[PDB]
Structures are given as C-alpha cells and as structure tokens.
Design an enzyme around this catalytic site. Structure first.
Site, mmCIF file in Angstrom:
data_model
loop_
_atom_site.group_PDB
_atom_site.id
_atom_site.type_symbol
_atom_site.label_atom_id
_atom_site.label_comp_id
_atom_site.label_asym_id
_atom_site.label_seq_id
_atom_site.Cartn_x
_atom_site.Cartn_y
_atom_site.Cartn_z
ATOM 1 C CB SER A 50 -11.457 9.680 -1.791
ATOM 2 O OG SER A 50 -11.247 8.469 -2.614
ATOM 3 C CG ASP B 165 -13.131 8.346 -5.391
ATOM 4 O OD1 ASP B 165 -12.095 8.954 -5.183
ATOM 5 O OD2 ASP B 165 -13.668 7.399 -4.876
ATOM 6 C CG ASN C 102 -8.471 7.180 -4.384
ATOM 7 O OD1 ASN C 102 -7.693 6.321 -4.990
ATOM 8 N ND2 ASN C 102 -8.575 7.199 -3.190
ATOM 9 C CG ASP D 51 -6.522 5.672 -0.710
ATOM 10 O OD1 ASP D 51 -7.800 5.846 -0.631
ATOM 11 O OD2 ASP D 51 -6.406 4.762 -1.565
ATOM 12 C CG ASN E 199 -11.311 6.382 0.496
ATOM 13 O OD1 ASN E 199 -12.236 6.631 0.654
ATOM 14 N ND2 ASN E 199 -10.428 6.673 -0.524
ATOM 15 C CD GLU F 248 -3.245 -0.683 0.093
ATOM 16 O OE1 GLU F 248 -3.064 0.400 -0.424
ATOM 17 O OE2 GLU F 248 -4.034 -1.621 -0.314
#
Length: 128
Positions: free
Chosen positions: A50, A48, A46, A52, A59, A35
């Site tokens: 968002s 969308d 991201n 992380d 998220n 990750e």
C-alpha cells in the site's frame, strides 16, 4: 505545497477540526507535522504494497483507491490522487471519516507516537 504551521492550523480550524471527535486543534496540526512534515504531496510506499498519501498520509489499502493496491476497500470513496492537492479539503474530509471510528486518532502512527500525551497546544501557540 508545504504549509506553514499557523497557516495549516487556520485552514484546519475553518474546516472544523478543532474539537472534532473531542480532539483539540493542536492534535491535528501535530499529526500533520509528523506524518508528512506539512507537505500536501508526501507519498510513502508501505511494505504490504500500500501507499500513504498527502498531508495526513491516508492509506491506499483501506481509505482511498490509487489503482495499484491489492484489496483496496476505499472507505473514503475517493482516488488517492485527490489527497495530493494543495487544498487539504479532501484529506480532512477523509480524516474525519477515519477518526469517527472507535479508535479515533490512534489510526495515525505518528500521532500515537509523537503527539498523544504531549502539550499539543504548543502546535498552535503564537498563531493568529
């Protein structure tokens, strides 16, 4: 901070992730590896809208509030900035919440893709 593999494993162990929700320690170390490459400051925007955050790439649309994500549920009830410190405690506490869900570790794409069904014991082989 960028943790070493054994150092992170020791930290995760102290925070009680070994066998949490039936997942042996190596799963959590593997997840962290893919990750964020063990970087407590990793951030990934991201599509969308968002983002992380941190070592376990939590998220901003569902789990922490970063102040800029439309419709944040903030289920961990914490600012995302709390997930960027060298101390992994807040990330582990939120990860515990996420993995308490019926889908467990499947919430982390990198785990699903690179760790699930592999020799996760290799991630802690040779550590203290």
């Amino acid at each position: 901070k960028v943790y070493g593999r054994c150092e992170l494993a020791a930290a995760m162990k102290r925070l009680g992730l070994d066998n949490y929700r039936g997942y042996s320690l190596g799963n959590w170390v593997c997840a962290a590896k893919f990750e964020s490459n063990f970087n407590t400051h990793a951030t990934n925007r991201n599509t969308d809208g968002s983002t992380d955050y941190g070592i376990l790439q939590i998220n901003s649309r569902w789990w922490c509030n970063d102040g800029r994500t439309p419709g944040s549920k903030n289920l961990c009830n914490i600012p995302c900035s709390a997930l960027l410190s060298s101390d992994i405690t807040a990330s582990v506490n939120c990860a515990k919440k996420i993995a308490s869900g019926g889908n467990g570790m499947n919430a982390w794409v990198a785990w699903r893709n690179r760790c699930k069904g592999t020799d996760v014991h290799a991630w802690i082989r040779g550590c203290r």
